[PDB]
Amino acid sequence: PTVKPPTARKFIWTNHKFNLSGTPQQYVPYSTTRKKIQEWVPPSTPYK
Amino acid sequence: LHHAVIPHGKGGRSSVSGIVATVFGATGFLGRYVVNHLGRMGSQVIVPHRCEPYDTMHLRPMGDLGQIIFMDWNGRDKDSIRRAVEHSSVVINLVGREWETQNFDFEDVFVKIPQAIAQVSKEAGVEKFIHISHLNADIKSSSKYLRSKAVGEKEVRETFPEATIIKPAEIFGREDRFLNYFANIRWFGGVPLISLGKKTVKQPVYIVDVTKGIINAIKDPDARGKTFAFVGPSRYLLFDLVQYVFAVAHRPFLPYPLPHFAYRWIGRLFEISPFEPWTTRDKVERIHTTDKILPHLPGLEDLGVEATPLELKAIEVLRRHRTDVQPAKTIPTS
Amino acid sequence: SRGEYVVAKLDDLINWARRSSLWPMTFGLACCAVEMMHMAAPRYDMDRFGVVFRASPRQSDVMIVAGTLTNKMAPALRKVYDQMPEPRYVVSMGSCANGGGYYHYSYSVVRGCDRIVPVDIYVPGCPPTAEALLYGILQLQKKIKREKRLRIWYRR
Amino acid sequence: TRPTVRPRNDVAHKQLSAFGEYVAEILPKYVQQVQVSCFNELEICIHPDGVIPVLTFLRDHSNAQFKSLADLTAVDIPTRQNRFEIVYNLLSLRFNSRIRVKTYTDELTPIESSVPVYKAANWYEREIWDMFGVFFANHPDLRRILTDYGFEGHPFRKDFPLSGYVELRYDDEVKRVVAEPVELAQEFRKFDLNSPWEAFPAYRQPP
Amino acid sequence: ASKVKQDMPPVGGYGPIDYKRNLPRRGLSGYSMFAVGIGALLFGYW
Amino acid sequence: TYKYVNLREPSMDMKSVTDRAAQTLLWTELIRGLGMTLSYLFREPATINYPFEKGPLSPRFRGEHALRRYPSGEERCIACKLCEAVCPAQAITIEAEPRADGSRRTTRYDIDMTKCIYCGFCQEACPVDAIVEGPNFEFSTETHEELLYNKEKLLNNGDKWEAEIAANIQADYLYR
Amino acid sequence: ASATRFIQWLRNWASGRDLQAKLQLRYQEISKRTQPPPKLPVGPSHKLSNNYYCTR
Amino acid sequence: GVRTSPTGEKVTHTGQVYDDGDYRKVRFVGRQKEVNENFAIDLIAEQPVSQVGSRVISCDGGGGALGHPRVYINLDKETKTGTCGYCGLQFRQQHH
Amino acid sequence: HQDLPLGLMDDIYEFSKNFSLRIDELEEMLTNNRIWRNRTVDIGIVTAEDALNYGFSGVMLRGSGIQWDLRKTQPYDVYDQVEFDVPIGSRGDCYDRYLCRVEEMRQSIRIISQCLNKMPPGEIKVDDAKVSPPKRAEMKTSMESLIHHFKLYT
Amino acid sequence: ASTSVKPIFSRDMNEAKRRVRELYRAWYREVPNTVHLFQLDISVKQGRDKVREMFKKNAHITDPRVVDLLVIKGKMELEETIKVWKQRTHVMRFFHETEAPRPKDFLSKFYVGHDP
Ligand SMILES: NC(=O)C1=CN([C@@H]2O[C@H](COP(=O)(O)OP(=O)(O)OC[C@H]3O[C@@H](n4cnc5c(N)ncnc54)[C@H](OP(=O)(O)O)[C@@H]3O)[C@@H](O)[C@H]2O)C=CC1
Ligand SMILES: CCCCCCCCCCCC(=O)OC[C@H](COP(=O)(O)OCC[N+](C)(C)C)OC(=O)CCCCCCCCCCC
Ligand code: SF4
Ligand code: SF4
Ligand code: SF4
Ligand SMILES: [Zn+2]
Numbered sequence A: 001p002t003v004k005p006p007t008a009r010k011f012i013w014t015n016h017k018f019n020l021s022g023t024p025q026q027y028v029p030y031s032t033t034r035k036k037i038q039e040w041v042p043p044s045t046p047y048k
Numbered sequence B: 001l002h003h004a005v006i007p008h009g010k011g012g013r014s015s016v017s018g019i020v021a022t023v024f025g026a027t028g029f030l031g032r033y034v035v036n037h038l039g040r041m042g043s044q045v046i047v048p049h050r051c052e053p054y055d056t057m058h059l060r061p062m063g064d065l066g067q068i069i070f071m072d073w074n075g076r077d078k079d080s081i082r083r084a085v086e087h088s089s090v091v092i093n094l095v096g097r098e099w100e101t102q103n104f105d106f107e108d109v110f111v112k113i114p115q116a117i118a119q120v121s122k123e124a125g126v127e128k129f130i131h132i133s134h135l136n137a138d139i140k141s142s143s144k145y146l147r148s149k150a151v152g153e154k155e156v157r158e159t160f161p162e163a164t165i166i167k168p169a170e171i172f173g174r175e176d177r178f179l180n181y182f183a184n185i186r187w188f189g190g191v192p193l194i195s196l197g198k199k200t201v202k203q204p205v206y207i208v209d210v211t212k213g214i215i216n217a218i219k220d221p222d223a224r225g226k227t228f229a230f231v232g233p234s235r236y237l238l239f240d241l242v243q244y245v246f247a248v249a250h251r252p253f254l255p256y257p258l259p260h261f262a263y264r265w266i267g268r269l270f271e272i273s274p275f276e277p278w279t280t281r282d283k284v285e286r287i288h289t290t291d292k293i294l295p296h297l298p299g300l301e302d303l304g305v306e307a308t309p310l311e312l313k314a315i316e317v318l319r320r321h322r323t324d325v326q327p328a329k330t331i332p333t334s
Numbered sequence C: 001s002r003g004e005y006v007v008a009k010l011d012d013l014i015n016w017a018r019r020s021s022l023w024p025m026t027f028g029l030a031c032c033a034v035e036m037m038h039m040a041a042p043r044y045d046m047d048r049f050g051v052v053f054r055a056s057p058r059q060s061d062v063m064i065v066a067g068t069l070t071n072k073m074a075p076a077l078r079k080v081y082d083q084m085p086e087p088r089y090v091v092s093m094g095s096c097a098n099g100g101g102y103y104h105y106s107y108s109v110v111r112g113c114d115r116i117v118p119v120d121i122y123v124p125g126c127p128p129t130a131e132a133l134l135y136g137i138l139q140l141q142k143k144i145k146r147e148k149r150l151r152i153w154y155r156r
Numbered sequence D: 001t002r003p004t005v006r007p008r009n010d011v012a013h014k015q016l017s018a019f020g021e022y023v024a025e026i027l028p029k030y031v032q033q034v035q036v037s038c039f040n041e042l043e044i045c046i047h048p049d050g051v052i053p054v055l056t057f058l059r060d061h062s063n064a065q066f067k068s069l070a071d072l073t074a075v076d077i078p079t080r081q082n083r084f085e086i087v088y089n090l091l092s093l094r095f096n097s098r099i100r101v102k103t104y105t106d107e108l109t110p111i112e113s114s115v116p117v118y119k120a121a122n123w124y125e126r127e128i129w130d131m132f133g134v135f136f137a138n139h140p141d142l143r144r145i146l147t148d149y150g151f152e153g154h155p156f157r158k159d160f161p162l163s164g165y166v167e168l169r170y171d172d173e174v175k176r177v178v179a180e181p182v183e184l185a186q187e188f189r190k191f192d193l194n195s196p197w198e199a200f201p202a203y204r205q206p207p
Numbered sequence E: 001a002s003k004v005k006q007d008m009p010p011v012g013g014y015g016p017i018d019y020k021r022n023l024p025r026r027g028l029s030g031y032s033m034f035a036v037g038i039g040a041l042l043f044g045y046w
Numbered sequence F: 001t002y003k004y005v006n007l008r009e010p011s012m013d014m015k016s017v018t019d020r021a022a023q024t025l026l027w028t029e030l031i032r033g034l035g036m037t038l039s040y041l042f043r044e045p046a047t048i049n050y051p052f053e054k055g056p057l058s059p060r061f062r063g064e065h066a067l068r069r070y071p072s073g074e075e076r077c078i079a080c081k082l083c084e085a086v087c088p089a090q091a092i093t094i095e096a097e098p099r100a101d102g103s104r105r106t107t108r109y110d111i112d113m114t115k116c117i118y119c120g121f122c123q124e125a126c127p128v129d130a131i132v133e134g135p136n137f138e139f140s141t142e143t144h145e146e147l148l149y150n151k152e153k154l155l156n157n158g159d160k161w162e163a164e165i166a167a168n169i170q171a172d173y174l175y176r
Numbered sequence G: 001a002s003a004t005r006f007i008q009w010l011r012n013w014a015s016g017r018d019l020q021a022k023l024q025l026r027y028q029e030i031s032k033r034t035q036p037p038p039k040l041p042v043g044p045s046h047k048l049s050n051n052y053y054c055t056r
Numbered sequence H: 001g002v003r004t005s006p007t008g009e010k011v012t013h014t015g016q017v018y019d020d021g022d023y024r025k026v027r028f029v030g031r032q033k034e035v036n037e038n039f040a041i042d043l044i045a046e047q048p049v050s051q052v053g054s055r056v057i058s059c060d061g062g063g064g065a066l067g068h069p070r071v072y073i074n075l076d077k078e079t080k081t082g083t084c085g086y087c088g089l090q091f092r093q094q095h096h
Numbered sequence I: 001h002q003d004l005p006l007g008l009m010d011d012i013y014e015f016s017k018n019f020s021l022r023i024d025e026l027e028e029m030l031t032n033n034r035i036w037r038n039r040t041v042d043i044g045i046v047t048a049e050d051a052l053n054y055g056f057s058g059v060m061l062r063g064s065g066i067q068w069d070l071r072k073t074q075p076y077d078v079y080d081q082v083e084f085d086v087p088i089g090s091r092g093d094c095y096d097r098y099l100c101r102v103e104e105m106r107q108s109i110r111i112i113s114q115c116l117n118k119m120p121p122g123e124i125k126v127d128d129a130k131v132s133p134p135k136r137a138e139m140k141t142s143m144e145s146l147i148h149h150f151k152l153y154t
Numbered sequence J: 001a002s003t004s005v006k007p008i009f010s011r012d013m014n015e016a017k018r019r020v021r022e023l024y025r026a027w028y029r030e031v032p033n034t035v036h037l038f039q040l041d042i043s044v045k046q047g048r049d050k051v052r053e054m055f056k057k058n059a060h061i062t063d064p065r066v067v068d069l070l071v072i073k074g075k076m077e078l079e080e081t082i083k084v085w086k087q088r089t090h091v092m093r094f095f096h097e098t099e100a101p102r103p104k105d106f107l108s109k110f111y112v113g114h115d116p
Helices: B029-040 B053-062 B078-085 B106-124 B144-159 B207-219 B238-248 B260-270 B281-287 B315-321 C003-019 C032-040 C074-082 C094-099 C130-145 C149-155 D010-026 D048-060 D121-132 E030-045 F014-026 F028-041 F082-086 F121-125 F151-175 G005-015 H023-028 I008-030 I034-040 I048-053 I094-118 I143-152 J013-028 J031-037 J044-057 J064-082 J088-094 J106-112
Strands: B020-024 B044-049 B068-072 B090-093 B128-132 B164-168 B191-193 B226-230 B255-257 C024-028 C062-066 C089-093 C121-123 D031-036 D042-046 D068-076 D084-092 D097-105 D166-171 D176-181 F002-004 F065-067 F092-098 F104-112 F131-133 H050-052 H056-059 H071-074 H090-093 I086-088
Touching: B020 B029, B020 B078, B029 B044, B029 B053, B029 B207, B044 B053, B044 B078, B044 H023, B053 B068, B068 B078, B078 B106, B090 B106, B106 B128, B106 B144, B128 B144, B128 B207, B144 B164, B144 B281, B164 B207, B191 B238, B207 B226, B238 B255, B238 B315, B260 B281, C003 C130, C003 C149, C024 C032, C024 C074, C032 C062, C032 C089, C032 C094, C032 C130, C062 C074, C062 C094, C074 D166, C074 D176, C089 C094, C089 C130, C094 C121, C121 C130, D010 D031, D010 D042, D010 D048, D010 D097, D042 D048, D048 D084, D048 D097, D068 D121, D176 J088, E030 F014, F014 F028, F028 G005, F028 I008, F028 I034, F065 F151, F082 F092, F082 F121, F104 F151, F121 F131, F131 F151, I008 I094, I034 I094, I086 I094, J013 J044, J013 J064, J031 J044
Parallel strands: B020 B044, B020 B090, B044 B068, B090 B128, B128 B164, B164 B226, B191 B255, C024 C062, C062 C089, C089 C121, D042 D097, F002 I086, H050 H090
Antiparallel strands: D031 D042, D068 D084, D084 D097, D166 D176, F065 F131, F092 F104, H056 H071
């Protein structure tokens, strides 16, 4: 890299991170999509 | 998954049961059976642990990916308990110990810690709370183990009124300290007993029955703010019971009496070690205490659990102690 | 000094010994066993870390599940695990042992060896290169180095 | 020539056609159909009663000497009443040729074991039994070869689910591996890939 | 507008590659191995 | 053409029979084996000093999957699902919708790295070089759940490994 | 290749063969790891006329 | 452009965030929620609009064979910019 | 899938020069070693007629003296344009099968020597985009190519 | 005709029923040996009950050929048990000890899920 440096991009990490498995900053999977079905919210005041 | 959590699926490993449980003391004898049943139906189980993560490994296979979650906690740190119950809808306390340690005595494991969990659970918004007590719990006995249980049971019933107290007898199973306790008296001589096992009546209960009872208390609505007494189907004399254990284990049975004070001293000798004591003064008292008969408390039959007779599932426990057995004489109901 | 300090050095000594003599029992079930053999080959020479090529199950400290675990083989693998003297660790090698991999949806494949035995390190790949497996063994050694068996005992 | 197209071999198509008639004439009692594919592979379709007669002739006859059983398998076509198609692939080292013999059966009708002709069929027939449920009569030792002990069903049948009906798992309460109904965290995604436009007009079936 | 460049052998091809078995013949004959062996015994006996 | 491997007749002249007698009694051929392993003792070993030395790889090496961007920061993936349709192990799960500005982008892009067979078909099928297999091969984890990547993990890998992915693609894009 | 002449003779004699001609370790006779860019050829069907697909 | 929910959890670029009463937040206790910080929708807005002198411009994403399939964008409508369907770059026609 | 990268064939040549010497070292440990011959000679003998009827193939036949090799009797690809020999056993035992395998490695090096010299130019996949996907360069410029790339991968 | 078909072993129900009993006697006499070799935690009587139940579920069969297959498969199962090809896990898969009972009443199904 001192002879052929990498191309610079503004989204590339400036700080390389080693394997974080087993540490408090590990990766935890989850769904990245929002809720599909919207349920009905009953009225907050009585009818009678 | 908006109001509580909606069950989904067939009730198998990859289903969703809607139960989000925090099981304190899940790394012990009764804990591994409670986690197995919760995780076997598709529940989100949170397992606080004080031990090495290596000692929690037998719990990882018990649930689908992401269903068993492990946290560090300290019995004397209220914040850690808060992090482990804030997201749960049911909290199960199985914290206990058969002996006192330099850092934890019976007033910590059975009174202060259970009350700490109950308080944090109440203000965290948890709706259901299951606490394990002892059948012979009352402040009148020579066992400091049983005196602590009575105090803790009252404090749990006060901090969390809607709690569900379970009062089981001596639980037997593969990893129990009851049938395996009456099988390790062979390297010293016969079988010491207060009196000769007479005037001591025991009503042991199967581990799966206790486990299945705790599960049904989570699902059952009419179990909030109630006390249960999980007991076996049959009653035995400690002499007859221990005789049966040795017969099933094919060990020579040579019972001889020993004075009550004499048994205390050998209990002192075996509690000087730094490891799990083989026996102690309190252990001898509890084994020789007579299992109370509380017919005013609903038991296993009130949760849809048929108590398992000790004769049916005693061979699976004592098989490993061996190097057509007559059932033990039982006390009639009368 | 404090009791924690004294019992923390003994923890280091036993942790050092156990990770410097990791003897593996390799369940070579499928192609991932070839890459396991390449980690013993001269280029990587796993024996230079103290990791003997192949120990008997009763002398073994770590089990490497390297390949597809089928239903027919599942009870056999559990029996070998139950007979391993402690402390015992399991390394899941490859996609088949990780989560079933290419045969995840088969009628005769266990969907991950972590339904039968507990797993300490998962090594991804199909197969992981011999260097990737070695990186996973050196991660298990780092995991043994972080154990606190005596601290937990002391603070009990 | 045409660089991207497979060249024909009309000499080998002629020879295999002649040998097919030869076999059809010598065994009219069983042979039901003979065909040669566009890539020069001879198929003899026979009645299942002719399995031993037809195979023995091809193995022993001086002009056949099909002394190797390359493979023996089954194909499940549910739309036929005889849903299974038993296929024999034979090799002749003397004449450097291959022949395929096909027959059929259903879930209940036995097939005759060709172990007396080719010893290699011992395990091939067990695999057919294990994976398709076709019973071979007079087999010296017929039993499952590939499936788990006590496995219910025959997986290679077209109506058997891909992921089966049971999955294994270790239960700590009973301290053993147990079988339970299959539940997949992610269901297999069934793709419908067929194009609605005919690809090969040469194979169009009559309306 | 350059030329096609793909992986090809050098002009003139590669050099010859040995494949035939090569186990060289070593040592003395059977007669001379027993002569040295017997002679060693005789000197030792003396 | 063919050759016989073991079809030679041993000579029966007295010299040859004595040459074979010397071999049997004096263990001559067992002593060549000792010479061949003494040779290897004085050859330099082929072992490398991992992890300070690494085994050589090539720009085509197939490692950890990762999601890339254009030079402007915009994601390359336009939620076409060709990678999902070709994955032999059915390890990719994609969901998509119109982004806030009308663009065609994924709301879900998961890869089950325990189903993946690390075959590279996805990066073959992608028309915009979005999903690639980077050069990383050291991402072993301690739990099964860390290998179920979602869109954030894959985008993080792309930002983390773009400097090296871009140079590997530049070295090999003319062969593909 | 860094072995001295003496150890070279010993390894050669014990094996019976000249090992230094064919070493199992790769020194600087292998291809450079950065190669010039290629320019691959096109197939027989890359034509602008007389290339109808029904004929091939 | 990572926004934080009232409880404190980061909102991902897909808009995902767990509600206040969702038990699934327990997976992040003792761990972290991995959220990519570079929102694509925000970075492609920063790119300047390109002024071209023709009705139809072609975009291939930049880089030739390393970009995306080459598409032609019509710029006759003066009330909006012509956006590339693959990469989001915008174009406008000079004074018409 | 792809074409050979520049510099590979020179690296295959360098590996192939030395590989016969590696086989000769293997033979210095096994072929004449009496202990190895005791474990393999006259062990597991298969008659040529049993081998054919039991469905054997490969050196399980050539070890018993059967002269059969699909690379020469039913050649595929360009095996009819290379020159090599088929090793044949005489006793049908483990030792003869071990010598067939070791001799097949020597013949494989012989074939590799001819592939390296006779490697021709051209493309590496059939120039029919309804079977083999087009190059990425033309998948990103031509409408037909993108259609055929799209449908060959879905 | 259409109804003419090859027999597997038995030409009518009477001959097939003979093979069923011969199989039942072989199974009935191996439960004590099976419960001993595999060190099962079940009793001999409930082991023989399971044998009876398996013979009872498919007791409505009237096709002689289907009966032959059920006996062919039954003998294969017996051979695996006698030879100890099976293990403790395979013998106990007849008892479904780990899956909770699925209620069979309409109301109980209605509360848990959408299945009939
Ligand atoms: N088993 C029986 O026979 C009987 C059980 N009970 C009661 O049920 C409860 C659990 O029973 P059981 O599982 O058999 O007992 P165990 O000894 O097998 O397990 C006790 C659990 O509590 C944990 N524990 C003990 N002290 C502490 C502490 N200071 N801080 C945190 N955790 C602690 C232990 O964690 P760790 O392992 O890491 O130390 C362990 O997980 C007890 O309260 C007991 O009184 C009631 C009647 C009979
Ligand atoms: C008095 C009680 C007896 C035990 C004495 C201590 C021995 C154990 C420590 C070595 C292992 C270790 O510590 O590992 C290697 C260490 C570095 O470890 P680190 O990465 O800094 O540790 C990080 C923290 N951990 C370990 C908790 C994760 O290397 C050293 O510099 C040690 C070299 C000097 C050792 C001298 C031993 C002399 C004692 C001989 C008689 C017992
Ligand atoms: S993970 Fe890949 S290499 Fe390993 S056994 Fe499975 S298919 Fe083979
Ligand atoms: S590399 Fe292969 S298995 Fe992995 S995601 Fe891509 S297509 Fe699927
Ligand atoms: S990664 Fe590529 S192939 Fe996959 S959906 Fe995105 S653009 Fe399509
Ligand atoms: Zn663009």
